[PDB]
Amino acid sequence: MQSLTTALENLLRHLSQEIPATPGIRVIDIPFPLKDAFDALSWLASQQTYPQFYWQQRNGDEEAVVLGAITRFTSLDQAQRFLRQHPEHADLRIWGLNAFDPSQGNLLLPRLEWRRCGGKATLRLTLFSESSLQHDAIQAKEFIATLVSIKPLPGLHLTTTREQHWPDKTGWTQLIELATKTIAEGELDKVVLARATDLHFASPVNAAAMMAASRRLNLNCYHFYMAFDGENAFLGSSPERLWRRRDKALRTEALAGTVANNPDDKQAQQLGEWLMADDKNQRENMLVVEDICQRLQADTQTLDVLPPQVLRLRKVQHLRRCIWTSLNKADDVICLHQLQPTAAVAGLPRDLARQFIARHEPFTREWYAGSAGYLSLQQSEFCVSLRSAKISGNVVRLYAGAGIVRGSDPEQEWQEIDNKAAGLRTLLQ
Provide the CATH number for the domain around residue 207: 3.60.120.10
Q: How many residues does the chain have?
A: 429
Q: How does DSSP classify residue 300?
A: B
Give the Cα separation of 138 and 16 in Å (integer): 10
Contact 367, 99 (CB under 8 A): yes
**Domain boundaries, position 163:** 1-429
Which positions are catalytic? 190, 240
Please give the C-alpha separations between residue 4 and each of 41, 67, 286, in angstroms, as whole numbers: 13, 14, 48
Please give the C-alpha separations between residue 103 and each of 157, 356, 370, in angstroms, as whole numbers: 36, 19, 10
Give the Cα separation of 261 and 242 in Å (integer): 23
DSSP characters over 70-121: EEEESSHHHHHHHHHT-TT-TT--EEEEE-SSTT-EEEEEEEEEEEEETTEE
At position 349, the amino acid (one-letter code) is P
Sign of the Cα pseudo-torsion (265, 424, 105, 413, in order): positive
Q: Which residues contact 25 (CB under 8 A, 6 or more apart)?
A: 86, 89, 92, 126, 127, 128, 133
Pairing mode, strands 379-384 and 241-246: antiparallel
Pairing mode, strands 232-238 and 388-392: antiparallel
Sign of the Cα pseudo-torsion (309, 310, 312, 315, in order): positive
Give the Cα separation of 16 and 190 in Å (integer): 60
Q: Solved how?
A: X-ray
Q: Cα 17–22–28 angle (5° rounding)?
A: 45
Strands in 157-248 per DSSP E: 160-166, 190-201, 222-227, 232-238, 241-246
Give the Cα separation of 227 and 239 in Å (integer): 21
Number of domains in the chain: 1
Give the Cα separation of 341 and 290 in Å (integer): 15
Please give the C-alpha separations between residue 17 and each of 11, 20, 70, in angstroms, as whole numbers: 10, 10, 21
Give the Cα separation of 85 and 382 in Å (integer): 22
Give the Cα separation of 429 and 426 in Å (integer): 6
With CA atoms as reference, report the closest residue to 155 among 74, 209, 113. 209
Give the Cα separation of 15 and 127 in Å (integer): 10
CA 316 to chain CA centroid, Å, is: 19
Give the Cα separation of 165 and 393 in Å (integer): 18
Q: Is 93 exposed, middle or buried (0-12, 13-18, 19+ CB in 10 A)?
A: buried
Phi, psi torsion values for 79, nearest 5 degrees: -55, -50
Pairing mode, strands 190-201 and 347-348: antiparallel
Map residue 167 onto helix, strand or coil. Answer: coil
Please give the C-alpha separations between residue 73 and each of 63, 108, 426, in angstroms, as whole numbers: 22, 6, 34
User: Which residues are documented as binding site?
Assistant: 284, 416
Q: Which residues contact 72 (CB under 8 A, 6 or more apart)?
A: 51, 106, 107, 108
State the angle between helix axes of 207-217 and 410-425 in degrees (0 to 180), rounded to the nearest 10: 100
Peptide bond into 308 cis (omega under 30): no
User: Which residues are documented as binding site for Mg(2+)?
Assistant: 284, 416
Give the Cα separation of 84 and 376 in Å (integer): 9
